[PDB]
Design a protein around this ligand. Structure first.
Ligand code: HEM
Ligand code: HEM
Ligand SMILES: CNCc1cncc(-c2cc(C)cc(N)n2)c1
Ligand SMILES: CNCc1cncc(-c2cc(C)cc(N)n2)c1
Ligand SMILES: C[C@H](O)[C@H](O)[C@H]1CNc2nc(N)[nH]c(=O)c2N1
Ligand SMILES: C[C@H](O)[C@H](O)[C@H]1CNc2nc(N)[nH]c(=O)c2N1
Ligand SMILES: [Cl-]
Ligand SMILES: [Cl-]
Ligand SMILES: [Gd+3]
Ligand SMILES: [Gd+3]
Ligand SMILES: [Gd+3]
Ligand SMILES: [Zn+2]
Lengths: 401, 400
């Protein structure tokens, strides 16, 4: 089993949990591909057996009365229907484990605190939209954010999938400009074009919240506008650079991923949006400073009167730090939950410690866990980590179009 | 079977066909990735291989002299159980090993390397002057020049040379009446060895250590370094006038002396190579790591930052100014240094060159991305393939 060192302190542990990794990643002994962003009844039965085993362990009833009954119930159902149905408690446990198992999530200290909305009876895109609005309202909670997931009906033979076409519930439009550029968020050019193609009347601002394109089984996507008062936003200002407000920058409160597939015991939920609260560097560093995103870094540095004609003045580093300050200040001023990268990484270290005792290890993707600014100033930089795939899981899936 | 590599900033795609050569295997399996871990008669096999590389590089594969050099290595191993490298081969392999180092962000320079051939060395005294030639050459009054000195290869039945220090220039680390260290904590061990072999310890936080040089089958001997030969830069800040009063310094020459050079199956456990610093190595890691000089809070106090809450980003602000002070001080002293923006931009050009030249480039994403401002540099947005090519610099155990 792999030995794992923390270089700040000298700690050494062994990741015995990785030996249970069923599905395989992209690396081989010849080459590591860890930096890549994107890496049958009997086999349904083995996945279900393992998950039922996981569930009955969690309720300290492994090998008991109910446990054997449930394994036999599942085999009979797969035999008779080609599939099976989770009990509500199994669904709650499986959603939590999927978060717990997510190697690129730095916020997993929170994994046991997840509100699970059971939407597996959803019948239409219109009902789907109602469920989504309830999710957003509950999770936003007027800025005191609460972690939640809404689970729509599972994939099943004979019927198409429920899908949310948008990659998140809240996204800003990205409009290909007149002179080649993009107005708004360049990450969202494609979904913006899809919304227009499906009858949306576009705006022309940099921060126009997109409509939702919601797909019911064997149905084309349907367009749904979010009420503005449902989408809580934060205007960005800086505590001491008063000209920063004049940039007119904003971000939204709720990070809600809506394009991933939830897998529990071999069953697949292609529509299961989940939400937490932001870590400030996602907004301040990636969304606002990536050259292919809002790309504000040079404009901010020029306004700061930094010397932008030489790299060795560290003008980029100085301006990124103040942009992150602005995000934290603005969300704190607006009373909207946010965590800075120092606090987030420190609590992740506690999570690693908890998980070593509970399970003997923790799947973690170092490149995603280490924040995009001030990497070695956080404790996770100095922590070796072992990346592997456990189930239940959130998986990437192709876009439905 | 040829990995697709995407740059997410631009959208460009390439394929790493070079990875198909990866001889020695890394630590990863389809079951789990270990990329973030720091330390994870067949001598003919990799001697043939290396010779074939050379003659291809000089556009001389399959012609006269290629055949000829294949025979003498055959004959030398048959007659002696090993072989000696031609001068030009020692040079070509030294550069290729640097070219192949997945963790080196400075490889745009790999073609410009000065190779000193110390293969006729014998005794810790000969090493000392051999190492002193390198240092004064590489240092060059602050106009740093990349250089490697190749001490004799390893032979069966006896010896091998070793430099006991991890680098040629290391600051001492002294324990206290309470354990905690004055000086560099990373060097507490070699410091205790240097004293243990009879060295008068200094009192201070930046005492340059003596060298423990090991001739084959000898107890090592201590060697003072001439102070005028160890170029150091006192640290000041352009606008924070008190920064000089913190009394911080770093040395000019980064020279790694504990690594084993391997060319064509031959092994050189003493083969120090040197370049010039990227400023985050000094300003971020050496000075701000909690287990190194750990000065971050002291600088933040002097800057009157709000260290009471993490969300003031006081750590980030103090760290940036420490890096500013490093770059400013090295430039004022006219000592070659490169900032992490310039360094990573040059590495992107290196990747582009290597794609044309060899169809790929082994790169360790976690080590290429700088330890501050990661996503502000282009390498953050570049997918990379990590694998082992030969010739290579390899890690080796401590000589005890
Ligand atoms: C409660 C506060 C939370 C914080 C602070 C947090 C933080 C983060 C961050 C910073 C990332 C990397 C995102 C990126 O760079 O694109 C991430 C990824 C992720 N998070 Fe969390 N998260 C939280 C809650 C949750 C919840 C509630 C779930 C699911 C139940 C979850 C599941 C995931 C998954 C699956 C990923 C990987 C997404 C991907 O790889 O594209 N997180 N999280
Ligand atoms: C010319 C300027 C150079 C720069 C700016 C540079 C930069 C760097 C940096 C920043 C590292 C990371 C080391 C660490 O974080 O501890 C590194 C590692 C490394 N460098 Fe370069 N380097 C240069 C020249 C060279 C030369 C001349 C050689 C050998 C001939 C070389 C071979 C290596 C190797 C083998 C490593 C891996 C060290 C390890 O794995 O611990 N570099 N370099
Ligand atoms: C494609 N990257 C996935 C992604 C993108 N944006 C934001 C997140 C995210 C998700 C959650 C639940 C919390 C958080 N703090 N962040 C994940
Ligand atoms: C433990 N990593 C090895 C190490 C440690 N310190 C510094 C370097 C280094 C080496 C070279 C040639 C250049 C540079 N700019 N830096 C390498
Ligand atoms: C190529 C590289 O893997 C890619 O840019 C990754 C690096 N680490 C990351 N880490 C997080 N948290 N989010 C990201 O999008 C990325 N991007
Ligand atoms: C655990 C982790 O791999 C370790 O801290 C690595 C990360 N990346 C690094 N990158 C460089 N250049 N140098 C280092 O020492 C490290 N340390
Ligand atoms: Cl986001
Ligand atoms: Cl160093
Ligand atoms: Gd003011
Ligand atoms: Gd303007
Ligand atoms: Gd005062
Ligand atoms: Zn790997």
């Amino acid at each position: 089993f792999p030995r794992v060192k923390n270089w700040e302190v000298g700690s050494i542990t062994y990741d015995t949990l990785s030996a249970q990794a069923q599905q395989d990643g992209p690396c081989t002994p010849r080459r590591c591909l860890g930096s890549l962003v994107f890496p049958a009844p009997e086999q349904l039965l083995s996945q279900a057996r393992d998950f039922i085993n996981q569930y009955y362990s969690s309720i300290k009833r492994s090998g008991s009365q109910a446990h054997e009954q449930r394994l036999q119930e599942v085999e009979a159902e797969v035999a008779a229907t080609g599939t099976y149905q989770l009990r509500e408690s199994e669904l709650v446990f499986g959603a939590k484990q999927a978060w717990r198992n997510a190697p690129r999530c730095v916020g997993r200290i929170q994994w046991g605190k997840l509100q699970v909305f059971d939407a597996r009876d959803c019948r239409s895109a219109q009902e789907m939209f109602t469920y989504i609005c309830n999710h957003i309202k509950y999770a936003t909670n007027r800025g005191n954010l609460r972690s939640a997931i809404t689970v729509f009906p599972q994939r099943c033979p004979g019927r198409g999938d429920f899908r949310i076409w948008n990659s998140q519930l809240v996204r800003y439009a990205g409009y290909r400009q007149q002179d080649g550029s993009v107005r708004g968020d360049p990450a969202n050019v494609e979904i913006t074009e899809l919304c227009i193609q499906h009858g949306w009347t576009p705006g022309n601002g940099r921060f126009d919240v997109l409509p939702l394109l919601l797909q019911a089984p064997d149905e084309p996507p349907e367009l749904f506008l979010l009420p503005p008062e449902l989408v809580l936003e934060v205007p960005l200002e800086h505590p001491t650079l008063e000209w920063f407000a004049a940039l007119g920058l904003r971000w939204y409160a709720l990070p809600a991923v809506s394009n991933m597939l939830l897998e529990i015991g071999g069953l697949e939920f292609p529509a299961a949006p989940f939400s937490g609260w932001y870590m400030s560097t996602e907004i301040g560093t990636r969304n606002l400073c990536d050259p292919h995103r809002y790309n504000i870094l040079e404009d901010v540095a020029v306004c700061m009167d930094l010397d932008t004609r030489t790299t060795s003045s560290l003008w980029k580093d100085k301006a990124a730090v103040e942009i992150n300050v602005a995000v934290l200040h603005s969300y704190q001023l607006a009373k909207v939950t946010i965590v800075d990268h120092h606090a987030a990484t420190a609590s992740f270290m506690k999570h690693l410690e908890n998980e070593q005792k509970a399970r003997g290890g923790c799947p973690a993707d170092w490149a995603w866990i280490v924040p995009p600014i001030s990497g070695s100033l956080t404790p996770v930089f100095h922590q070796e980590m072992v990346n592997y795939f456990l189930s239940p899981a959130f998986r990437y899936q192709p876009d439905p179009w």
